[PDB]
Design a protein around this nucleic acid. Structure first.
Length: 212
RNA sequence: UUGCUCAAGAGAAGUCAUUUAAUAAGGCCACUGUUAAACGUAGGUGAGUCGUGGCUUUAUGCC
């Protein structure tokens, strides 16, 4: 079987807000599979979210990022008048600094050709043939990606912090996100096990599927 | 196209007014640079101004 694609990520700042963290901007320690899937769709310029259902992603943390809080005068739709003072609320947002990670992309379970792995490989092969809009980012639109590149299993040849699907794990990362409410959001429990493993273990793979 | 798409902690503020490190003090008292000698005899040099004036025989030397 074709070897899974490996991407090296380096984002100076990230915000993977929690699904239930609406009063305060609490962030996940590791990018959720849904956020990575959306980033890959943006990378290949695919607006439809159901197009690449079935792709399996594995995330390996190259280092533990530090969590910091920043104040922000975030806006909201509370009053009909745009200039009303009620539309601006001060709230904290937790960010992660100097995030480096390796992403494994495996597209065996996709039923629509070309697969996401092939699309990413073709986009990296001929960047001038990619038809997309906006700037690539991970998390919030202002959190641009510093380095995204094709890498091998030993890019830093160091020790890797894998995200393992453990039913007793701490983190509850979503692989599908409902941006309106929380009905269609689907969750999975993960843990961060320190494993130099270059390759992902079997439990480190998460398949992105529709909530149906 | 990413729990995403939009999102200024923003506008203003003298650390200010006053305060002698001041009053007193000898680095002082003592010291010999004493004693003796044969010059026997052989070593050198760096710098201007331009056409008769008082004596004196032109002379040629003095001021």
């Amino acid at each position: 079987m074709i070897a899974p694609l490996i991407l090296y990520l380096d984002v100076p700042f990230t915000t993977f807000r929690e699904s239930h963290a609406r009063e305060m901007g609490k962030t996940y320690p590791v990018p959720p599979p849904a956020t990575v899937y959306g980033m890959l769709l943006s990378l290949v310029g695919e607006t439809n979210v159901y197009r690449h259902c079935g792709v399996e992603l594995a995330i390996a943390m190259l280092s533990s990022p530090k969590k910091s809080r920043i104040l922000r005068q975030m806006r909201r739709f509370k009053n009909a008048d745009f200039s009303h003072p009620e539309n601006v609320i001060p709230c904290y947002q937790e960010i992660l600094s100097n995030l480096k990670c390796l992403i494994w992309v495996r597209s065996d379970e996709e039923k629509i050709q070309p697969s996401l792995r092939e699309r990413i490989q073709l986009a990296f092969d001929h960047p001038e043939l990619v038809r997309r809009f906006g700037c690539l980012f991970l998390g919030e639109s202002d959190q641009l990606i510093k380095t995204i590149k094709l890498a091998r299993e030993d890019y830093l040849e160091g020790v890797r912090q894998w995200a393992i699907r453990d039913n007793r794990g701490r983190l509850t990362l979503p692989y599908w996100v409902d941006h309106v409410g929380s009905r269609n959001t689907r969750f999975l429990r993960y843990r961060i096990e320190e494993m130099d493993r270059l390759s992902p273990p079997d439990l480190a793979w998460t398949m992105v599927q529709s909530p149906i």
